[PDB]
Design a protein around this nucleic acid. Structure first.
Ligand SMILES: [Zn+2]
Ligand SMILES: [Zn+2]
Length: 89
DNA sequence: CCGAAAAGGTCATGCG
DNA sequence: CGCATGACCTTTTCGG
C-alpha cells in the first residue's frame, strides 16, 4: 500500500500526508467534531487496512504521528468551502 | 486550455 | 434504528 497510516491504497495528499480516503475522512470528522478518543488497550493497537476501525484513538494517534495537519481541516469562515484556496493575486 | 491536486459533499452499507 | 465508515462525486485553483 501507500497510505502512511493504515497502508491502504493512496493516490494523493490529505492534510499533509499521503493517505487513503478511509483515513482521509477519519481525520476530518475527528478534527471537525473535535472528537476525543480513548484506547481500551494500551495505546498501541494495530493500525492497518484491516484493523484500523477496531480502535479509534490509535488510528488518530498515528494520523498525527505521520504528521496530518489538523489546521488544514477548514473551519469557521472556511467551513463548507471546497477545492483549492487561492494563492495568486 | 486542462488536467493534477486536494478540500468538502454524498449517501449506500453494515456492524453494532 | 442510529451513527460511522469510505468509494465516488463536485468544487476551486493553479502549474505544465
Ligand atoms: Zn489509511
Ligand atoms: Zn488503541
Amino acid at each position: 500500500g501507500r497510505c502512511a497510516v493504515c497502508g491502504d491504497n493512496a493516490s494523493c495528499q490529505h492534510y499533509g500526508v499521503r493517505t487513503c480516503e478511509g483515513c482521509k475522512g477519519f481525520f476530518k470528522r475527528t478534527v471537525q467534531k473535535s472528537a476525543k478518543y480513548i484506547c481500551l488497550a494500551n495505546k498501541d493497537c494495530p493500525v492497518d487496512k484491516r484493523r484500523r476501525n477496531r480502535c479509534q484513538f490509535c488510528r488518530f494517534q498515528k494520523c498525527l504521528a505521520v504528521g496530518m495537519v489538523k489546521e488544514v481541516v477548514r473551519t469557521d469562515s472556511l467551513k463548507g468551502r471546497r477545492g483549492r484556496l487561492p494563492s495568486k493575486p
